[PDB]
Amino acid sequence: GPGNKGSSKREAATESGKTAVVFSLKNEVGGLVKALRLFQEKRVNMVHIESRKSRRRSSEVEIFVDCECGKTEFNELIQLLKFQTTIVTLNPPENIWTEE
Amino acid sequence: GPGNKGSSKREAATESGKTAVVFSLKNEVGGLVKALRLFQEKRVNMVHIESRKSRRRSSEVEIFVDCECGKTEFNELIQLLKFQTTIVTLNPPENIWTEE
Ligand SMILES: N[C@@H](Cc1ccccc1)C(=O)O
Ligand SMILES: N[C@@H](Cc1ccccc1)C(=O)O
């Protein structure tokens, strides 16, 4: 039975998609690592990360995290992130582009 | 070697500048948080962060971290970062070039 062939195996996938969420936190040191460690807990790797800091004396800053993961996993992760801070923006900042 | 009790009431803002370093790590999940937690240890906040992922099947990825801190503190931090991975790129001056 086993050991016969199996040199190649195709895994099914539910198409492809991306997820992104804007997470806000205090401009404290290490605030970002606590936000990203949650992604590590769910074993979700990020593909892009960008932080924006305003000079309007804002105590809080917005950090954009882009990652690819299942929508269910994503929703669960977002719910955990929402615990730390209220997230009302779940859209990417396509308004601002970067040279990259 | 603990010092004596005292307080530094002398401060100077004569020295000012920015620091940046390119830190490379494996494309593992949570690799970035370990890199950034070191900044937290030195109480260094980052002002900009950007990660680059290639599709050339590179096991390692390069993450750019920009922060403002003392040069001495920065050098010490870099030395700690160098422990985790060899860093040969330290924000090179690609703006100018020479043909020596
Ligand atoms: N994929 C790695 C490195 C990385 C961080 C952020 C953006 C892109 C890549 C991680 O999740 O730690
Ligand atoms: N200043 C905060 C948030 C931040 C992260 C990265 C870039 C800019 C700001 C921190 O160091 O966690």
PDB file of C-alpha atoms and ligand atoms in Angstrom:
ATOM      1  CA  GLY A   1       0.000   0.000   0.000  1.00  0.00           C
ATOM      2  CA  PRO A   2       2.186   2.755   1.336  1.00  0.00           C
ATOM      3  CA  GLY A   3       5.492   3.631  -0.272  1.00  0.00           C
ATOM      4  CA  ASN A   4       3.904   3.028  -3.643  1.00  0.00           C
ATOM      5  CA  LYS A   5       4.404   6.266  -5.548  1.00  0.00           C
ATOM      6  CA  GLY A   6       3.348   9.342  -3.585  1.00  0.00           C
ATOM      7  CA  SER A   7       6.227  11.196  -5.193  1.00  0.00           C
ATOM      8  CA  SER A   8       3.798  14.016  -5.871  1.00  0.00           C
ATOM      9  CA  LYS A   9       0.643  15.184  -4.171  1.00  0.00           C
ATOM     10  CA  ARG A  10      -1.621  18.076  -5.044  1.00  0.00           C
ATOM     11  CA  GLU A  11      -3.331  19.812  -2.161  1.00  0.00           C
ATOM     12  CA  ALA A  12      -6.706  21.404  -2.725  1.00  0.00           C
ATOM     13  CA  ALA A  13      -7.067  25.086  -1.980  1.00  0.00           C
ATOM     14  CA  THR A  14     -10.074  27.349  -1.653  1.00  0.00           C
ATOM     15  CA  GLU A  15      -9.044  29.669  -4.474  1.00  0.00           C
ATOM     16  CA  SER A  16      -6.911  32.537  -3.230  1.00  0.00           C
ATOM     17  CA  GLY A  17      -7.530  35.773  -1.395  1.00  0.00           C
ATOM     18  CA  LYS A  18      -5.963  38.345   0.855  1.00  0.00           C
ATOM     19  CA  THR A  19      -6.845  39.974   4.117  1.00  0.00           C
ATOM     20  CA  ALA A  20      -5.869  43.243   5.672  1.00  0.00           C
ATOM     21  CA  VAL A  21      -6.765  45.213   8.757  1.00  0.00           C
ATOM     22  CA  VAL A  22      -5.815  48.526  10.286  1.00  0.00           C
ATOM     23  CA  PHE A  23      -4.809  48.168  13.900  1.00  0.00           C
ATOM     24  CA  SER A  24      -4.509  51.214  16.124  1.00  0.00           C
ATOM     25  CA  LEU A  25      -2.443  51.373  19.257  1.00  0.00           C
ATOM     26  CA  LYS A  26      -0.802  53.830  21.605  1.00  0.00           C
ATOM     27  CA  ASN A  27       2.468  55.356  20.518  1.00  0.00           C
ATOM     28  CA  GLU A  28       4.176  53.301  23.188  1.00  0.00           C
ATOM     29  CA  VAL A  29       7.372  51.352  22.709  1.00  0.00           C
ATOM     30  CA  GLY A  30       6.704  47.710  21.930  1.00  0.00           C
ATOM     31  CA  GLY A  31       3.068  48.376  21.096  1.00  0.00           C
ATOM     32  CA  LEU A  32       3.602  46.992  17.610  1.00  0.00           C
ATOM     33  CA  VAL A  33       5.182  43.707  18.757  1.00  0.00           C
ATOM     34  CA  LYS A  34       2.136  42.925  20.907  1.00  0.00           C
ATOM     35  CA  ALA A  35      -0.062  43.491  17.905  1.00  0.00           C
ATOM     36  CA  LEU A  36       2.051  41.294  15.638  1.00  0.00           C
ATOM     37  CA  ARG A  37       2.583  38.539  18.235  1.00  0.00           C
ATOM     38  CA  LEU A  38      -1.135  37.807  17.922  1.00  0.00           C
ATOM     39  CA  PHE A  39      -0.560  36.949  14.273  1.00  0.00           C
ATOM     40  CA  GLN A  40       2.185  34.572  15.395  1.00  0.00           C
ATOM     41  CA  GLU A  41      -0.231  32.855  17.780  1.00  0.00           C
ATOM     42  CA  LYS A  42      -2.574  32.073  14.909  1.00  0.00           C
ATOM     43  CA  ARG A  43       0.442  31.102  12.786  1.00  0.00           C
ATOM     44  CA  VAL A  44      -0.399  33.836  10.313  1.00  0.00           C
ATOM     45  CA  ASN A  45       2.501  35.363   8.453  1.00  0.00           C
ATOM     46  CA  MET A  46       2.255  38.901   7.179  1.00  0.00           C
ATOM     47  CA  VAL A  47       3.266  39.793   3.648  1.00  0.00           C
ATOM     48  CA  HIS A  48       3.386  43.535   4.116  1.00  0.00           C
ATOM     49  CA  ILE A  49       3.537  45.889   7.048  1.00  0.00           C
ATOM     50  CA  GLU A  50       3.469  49.659   7.206  1.00  0.00           C
ATOM     51  CA  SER A  51       3.142  52.049  10.112  1.00  0.00           C
ATOM     52  CA  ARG A  52       2.021  55.651   9.947  1.00  0.00           C
ATOM     53  CA  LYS A  53       2.969  58.244  12.515  1.00  0.00           C
ATOM     54  CA  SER A  54       1.348  61.654  12.549  1.00  0.00           C
ATOM     55  CA  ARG A  55       2.936  64.825  13.857  1.00  0.00           C
ATOM     56  CA  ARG A  56      -0.402  66.140  15.061  1.00  0.00           C
ATOM     57  CA  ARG A  57       0.530  65.094  18.597  1.00  0.00           C
ATOM     58  CA  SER A  58      -1.627  62.003  18.293  1.00  0.00           C
ATOM     59  CA  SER A  59      -1.227  59.691  21.260  1.00  0.00           C
ATOM     60  CA  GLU A  60      -2.317  56.813  19.065  1.00  0.00           C
ATOM     61  CA  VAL A  61      -0.925  55.742  15.732  1.00  0.00           C
ATOM     62  CA  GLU A  62      -2.312  53.538  12.991  1.00  0.00           C
ATOM     63  CA  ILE A  63      -0.428  50.496  11.790  1.00  0.00           C
ATOM     64  CA  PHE A  64      -1.464  48.639   8.657  1.00  0.00           C
ATOM     65  CA  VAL A  65      -0.939  44.900   8.503  1.00  0.00           C
ATOM     66  CA  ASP A  66      -1.484  42.878   5.342  1.00  0.00           C
ATOM     67  CA  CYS A  67      -1.508  39.099   5.524  1.00  0.00           C
ATOM     68  CA  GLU A  68      -2.811  36.078   3.677  1.00  0.00           C
ATOM     69  CA  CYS A  69      -4.838  33.597   5.649  1.00  0.00           C
ATOM     70  CA  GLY A  70      -8.235  31.928   5.752  1.00  0.00           C
ATOM     71  CA  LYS A  71     -11.161  34.286   6.199  1.00  0.00           C
ATOM     72  CA  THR A  72     -12.352  32.299   9.213  1.00  0.00           C
ATOM     73  CA  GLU A  73      -8.894  32.440  10.771  1.00  0.00           C
ATOM     74  CA  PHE A  74      -8.672  36.085   9.872  1.00  0.00           C
ATOM     75  CA  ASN A  75     -12.019  36.893  11.475  1.00  0.00           C
ATOM     76  CA  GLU A  76     -10.985  35.059  14.630  1.00  0.00           C
ATOM     77  CA  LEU A  77      -7.686  36.941  14.669  1.00  0.00           C
ATOM     78  CA  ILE A  78      -9.429  40.246  14.141  1.00  0.00           C
ATOM     79  CA  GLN A  79     -11.758  39.514  17.037  1.00  0.00           C
ATOM     80  CA  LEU A  80      -8.720  38.970  19.254  1.00  0.00           C
ATOM     81  CA  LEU A  81      -7.122  42.151  17.965  1.00  0.00           C
ATOM     82  CA  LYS A  82     -10.388  44.007  18.593  1.00  0.00           C
ATOM     83  CA  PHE A  83     -10.062  43.031  22.244  1.00  0.00           C
ATOM     84  CA  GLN A  84      -6.926  45.154  22.597  1.00  0.00           C
ATOM     85  CA  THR A  85      -8.367  48.095  20.663  1.00  0.00           C
ATOM     86  CA  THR A  86     -11.566  48.972  18.878  1.00  0.00           C
ATOM     87  CA  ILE A  87     -11.070  48.536  15.164  1.00  0.00           C
ATOM     88  CA  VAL A  88     -13.534  50.371  12.965  1.00  0.00           C
ATOM     89  CA  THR A  89     -11.370  50.460   9.866  1.00  0.00           C
ATOM     90  CA  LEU A  90     -10.952  47.229   7.979  1.00  0.00           C
ATOM     91  CA  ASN A  91      -9.728  48.577   4.690  1.00  0.00           C
ATOM     92  CA  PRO A  92      -6.314  49.024   3.162  1.00  0.00           C
ATOM     93  CA  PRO A  93      -4.795  52.454   2.677  1.00  0.00           C
ATOM     94  CA  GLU A  94      -4.961  52.490  -1.089  1.00  0.00           C
ATOM     95  CA  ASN A  95      -5.245  56.262  -0.781  1.00  0.00           C
ATOM     96  CA  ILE A  96      -1.553  56.480   0.050  1.00  0.00           C
ATOM     97  CA  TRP A  97       0.850  54.688  -2.240  1.00  0.00           C
ATOM     98  CA  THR A  98       4.509  53.998  -1.600  1.00  0.00           C
ATOM     99  CA  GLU A  99       7.502  53.733  -3.897  1.00  0.00           C
ATOM    100  CA  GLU A 100       8.298  50.297  -2.494  1.00  0.00           C
TER     101      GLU A 100
ATOM    102  CA  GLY B   1      28.946  46.755  38.614  1.00  0.00           C
ATOM    103  CA  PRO B   2      26.145  48.790  40.101  1.00  0.00           C
ATOM    104  CA  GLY B   3      26.660  52.528  40.192  1.00  0.00           C
ATOM    105  CA  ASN B   4      25.926  54.860  43.056  1.00  0.00           C
ATOM    106  CA  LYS B   5      22.677  56.715  43.579  1.00  0.00           C
ATOM    107  CA  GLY B   6      22.321  59.832  41.499  1.00  0.00           C
ATOM    108  CA  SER B   7      20.392  61.360  38.657  1.00  0.00           C
ATOM    109  CA  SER B   8      21.365  62.826  35.320  1.00  0.00           C
ATOM    110  CA  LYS B   9      20.005  66.345  35.302  1.00  0.00           C
ATOM    111  CA  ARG B  10      22.339  67.266  32.476  1.00  0.00           C
ATOM    112  CA  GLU B  11      20.893  66.750  29.032  1.00  0.00           C
ATOM    113  CA  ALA B  12      21.839  68.060  25.629  1.00  0.00           C
ATOM    114  CA  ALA B  13      20.084  68.030  22.287  1.00  0.00           C
ATOM    115  CA  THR B  14      23.137  69.159  20.356  1.00  0.00           C
ATOM    116  CA  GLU B  15      23.446  65.729  18.799  1.00  0.00           C
ATOM    117  CA  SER B  16      20.509  64.802  16.626  1.00  0.00           C
ATOM    118  CA  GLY B  17      20.061  62.495  13.681  1.00  0.00           C
ATOM    119  CA  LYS B  18      18.378  59.355  12.479  1.00  0.00           C
ATOM    120  CA  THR B  19      19.400  55.745  12.371  1.00  0.00           C
ATOM    121  CA  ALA B  20      18.348  52.859  10.222  1.00  0.00           C
ATOM    122  CA  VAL B  21      19.421  49.285   9.702  1.00  0.00           C
ATOM    123  CA  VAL B  22      18.425  46.424   7.462  1.00  0.00           C
ATOM    124  CA  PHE B  23      17.772  43.277   9.421  1.00  0.00           C
ATOM    125  CA  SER B  24      17.494  39.945   7.653  1.00  0.00           C
ATOM    126  CA  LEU B  25      15.704  36.949   9.041  1.00  0.00           C
ATOM    127  CA  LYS B  26      14.143  33.680   7.987  1.00  0.00           C
ATOM    128  CA  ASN B  27      10.708  33.817   6.446  1.00  0.00           C
ATOM    129  CA  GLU B  28       9.368  32.215   9.594  1.00  0.00           C
ATOM    130  CA  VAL B  29       6.262  33.314  11.431  1.00  0.00           C
ATOM    131  CA  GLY B  30       7.064  35.628  14.316  1.00  0.00           C
ATOM    132  CA  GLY B  31      10.563  36.308  13.031  1.00  0.00           C
ATOM    133  CA  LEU B  32       9.795  40.014  12.839  1.00  0.00           C
ATOM    134  CA  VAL B  33       8.503  40.308  16.424  1.00  0.00           C
ATOM    135  CA  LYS B  34      11.781  38.901  17.766  1.00  0.00           C
ATOM    136  CA  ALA B  35      13.669  41.457  15.748  1.00  0.00           C
ATOM    137  CA  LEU B  36      11.510  44.340  16.955  1.00  0.00           C
ATOM    138  CA  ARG B  37      11.382  43.181  20.597  1.00  0.00           C
ATOM    139  CA  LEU B  38      15.096  43.982  20.784  1.00  0.00           C
ATOM    140  CA  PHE B  39      14.245  47.603  20.036  1.00  0.00           C
ATOM    141  CA  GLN B  40      11.751  47.478  22.903  1.00  0.00           C
ATOM    142  CA  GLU B  41      14.467  46.218  25.250  1.00  0.00           C
ATOM    143  CA  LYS B  42      16.585  49.268  24.504  1.00  0.00           C
ATOM    144  CA  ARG B  43      13.453  51.433  24.742  1.00  0.00           C
ATOM    145  CA  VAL B  44      13.910  52.509  21.145  1.00  0.00           C
ATOM    146  CA  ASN B  45      10.768  53.356  19.242  1.00  0.00           C
ATOM    147  CA  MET B  46      10.689  52.972  15.494  1.00  0.00           C
ATOM    148  CA  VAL B  47       9.319  55.706  13.273  1.00  0.00           C
ATOM    149  CA  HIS B  48       9.024  53.654  10.120  1.00  0.00           C
ATOM    150  CA  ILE B  49       8.994  49.988   9.273  1.00  0.00           C
ATOM    151  CA  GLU B  50       8.849  48.213   5.945  1.00  0.00           C
ATOM    152  CA  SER B  51       9.300  44.578   5.020  1.00  0.00           C
ATOM    153  CA  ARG B  52      10.183  43.214   1.613  1.00  0.00           C
ATOM    154  CA  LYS B  53       9.315  39.727   0.472  1.00  0.00           C
ATOM    155  CA  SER B  54      10.697  38.302  -2.741  1.00  0.00           C
ATOM    156  CA  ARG B  55       9.077  35.650  -4.887  1.00  0.00           C
ATOM    157  CA  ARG B  56      12.428  34.182  -5.843  1.00  0.00           C
ATOM    158  CA  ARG B  57      11.879  31.409  -3.296  1.00  0.00           C
ATOM    159  CA  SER B  58      14.174  33.156  -0.851  1.00  0.00           C
ATOM    160  CA  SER B  59      14.189  31.471   2.535  1.00  0.00           C
ATOM    161  CA  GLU B  60      15.243  34.755   4.077  1.00  0.00           C
ATOM    162  CA  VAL B  61      13.627  38.143   3.742  1.00  0.00           C
ATOM    163  CA  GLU B  62      14.894  41.641   4.422  1.00  0.00           C
ATOM    164  CA  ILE B  63      13.099  43.955   6.804  1.00  0.00           C
ATOM    165  CA  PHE B  64      13.942  47.643   7.002  1.00  0.00           C
ATOM    166  CA  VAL B  65      13.638  49.362  10.359  1.00  0.00           C
ATOM    167  CA  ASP B  66      14.013  53.110  10.788  1.00  0.00           C
ATOM    168  CA  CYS B  67      14.273  54.584  14.262  1.00  0.00           C
ATOM    169  CA  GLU B  68      15.582  57.627  16.067  1.00  0.00           C
ATOM    170  CA  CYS B  69      17.923  57.042  18.955  1.00  0.00           C
ATOM    171  CA  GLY B  70      21.410  57.862  20.185  1.00  0.00           C
ATOM    172  CA  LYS B  71      24.219  56.594  17.987  1.00  0.00           C
ATOM    173  CA  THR B  72      25.787  54.813  20.955  1.00  0.00           C
ATOM    174  CA  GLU B  73      22.480  53.163  21.815  1.00  0.00           C
ATOM    175  CA  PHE B  74      21.964  52.375  18.174  1.00  0.00           C
ATOM    176  CA  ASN B  75      25.385  50.765  17.831  1.00  0.00           C
ATOM    177  CA  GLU B  76      24.750  48.673  20.929  1.00  0.00           C
ATOM    178  CA  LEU B  77      21.362  47.635  19.561  1.00  0.00           C
ATOM    179  CA  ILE B  78      22.852  46.761  16.206  1.00  0.00           C
ATOM    180  CA  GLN B  79      25.470  44.611  17.896  1.00  0.00           C
ATOM    181  CA  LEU B  80      22.678  42.689  19.613  1.00  0.00           C
ATOM    182  CA  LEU B  81      20.789  42.377  16.347  1.00  0.00           C
ATOM    183  CA  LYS B  82      23.984  41.185  14.648  1.00  0.00           C
ATOM    184  CA  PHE B  83      24.042  38.310  17.122  1.00  0.00           C
ATOM    185  CA  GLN B  84      20.830  36.898  15.652  1.00  0.00           C
ATOM    186  CA  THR B  85      21.918  37.435  12.047  1.00  0.00           C
ATOM    187  CA  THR B  86      24.886  38.840  10.198  1.00  0.00           C
ATOM    188  CA  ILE B  87      24.096  42.339   9.033  1.00  0.00           C
ATOM    189  CA  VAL B  88      26.239  43.659   6.212  1.00  0.00           C
ATOM    190  CA  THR B  89      23.789  46.284   5.023  1.00  0.00           C
ATOM    191  CA  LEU B  90      23.424  49.326   7.220  1.00  0.00           C
ATOM    192  CA  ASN B  91      21.442  51.841   5.178  1.00  0.00           C
ATOM    193  CA  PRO B  92      24.012  52.374   2.459  1.00  0.00           C
ATOM    194  CA  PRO B  93      24.299  55.653   0.602  1.00  0.00           C
ATOM    195  CA  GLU B  94      22.851  54.496  -2.689  1.00  0.00           C
ATOM    196  CA  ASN B  95      22.070  58.163  -3.290  1.00  0.00           C
ATOM    197  CA  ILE B  96      25.656  58.716  -4.392  1.00  0.00           C
ATOM    198  CA  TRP B  97      28.132  56.460  -6.115  1.00  0.00           C
ATOM    199  CA  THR B  98      31.814  56.531  -6.948  1.00  0.00           C
ATOM    200  CA  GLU B  99      33.981  54.761  -9.470  1.00  0.00           C
ATOM    201  CA  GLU B 100      37.224  54.280  -7.608  1.00  0.00           C
TER     202      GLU B 100
HETATM  203  N1  LIG C   1       7.043  36.539   7.149  1.00  0.00           N
HETATM  204  C1  LIG C   1       7.800  37.003   8.348  1.00  0.00           C
HETATM  205  C2  LIG C   1       8.555  38.307   7.992  1.00  0.00           C
HETATM  206  C3  LIG C   1       7.682  39.432   7.527  1.00  0.00           C
HETATM  207  C4  LIG C   1       7.182  40.357   8.423  1.00  0.00           C
HETATM  208  C5  LIG C   1       6.384  41.387   7.986  1.00  0.00           C
HETATM  209  C6  LIG C   1       6.073  41.502   6.656  1.00  0.00           C
HETATM  210  C7  LIG C   1       6.565  40.590   5.757  1.00  0.00           C
HETATM  211  C8  LIG C   1       7.365  39.559   6.192  1.00  0.00           C
HETATM  212  C9  LIG C   1       6.998  37.263   9.634  1.00  0.00           C
HETATM  213  O1  LIG C   1       5.741  37.138   9.596  1.00  0.00           O
HETATM  214  O2  LIG C   1       7.637  37.580  10.680  1.00  0.00           O
HETATM  215  N1  LIG C   2       6.050  53.768  18.055  1.00  0.00           N
HETATM  216  C1  LIG C   2       5.375  52.448  18.222  1.00  0.00           C
HETATM  217  C2  LIG C   2       4.515  52.162  16.965  1.00  0.00           C
HETATM  218  C3  LIG C   2       5.276  52.142  15.674  1.00  0.00           C
HETATM  219  C4  LIG C   2       5.802  50.964  15.181  1.00  0.00           C
HETATM  220  C5  LIG C   2       6.496  50.954  13.995  1.00  0.00           C
HETATM  221  C6  LIG C   2       6.676  52.118  13.292  1.00  0.00           C
HETATM  222  C7  LIG C   2       6.160  53.293  13.774  1.00  0.00           C
HETATM  223  C8  LIG C   2       5.464  53.306  14.958  1.00  0.00           C
HETATM  224  C9  LIG C   2       6.268  51.221  18.465  1.00  0.00           C
HETATM  225  O1  LIG C   2       7.524  51.375  18.449  1.00  0.00           O
HETATM  226  O2  LIG C   2       5.705  50.108  18.681  1.00  0.00           O
END
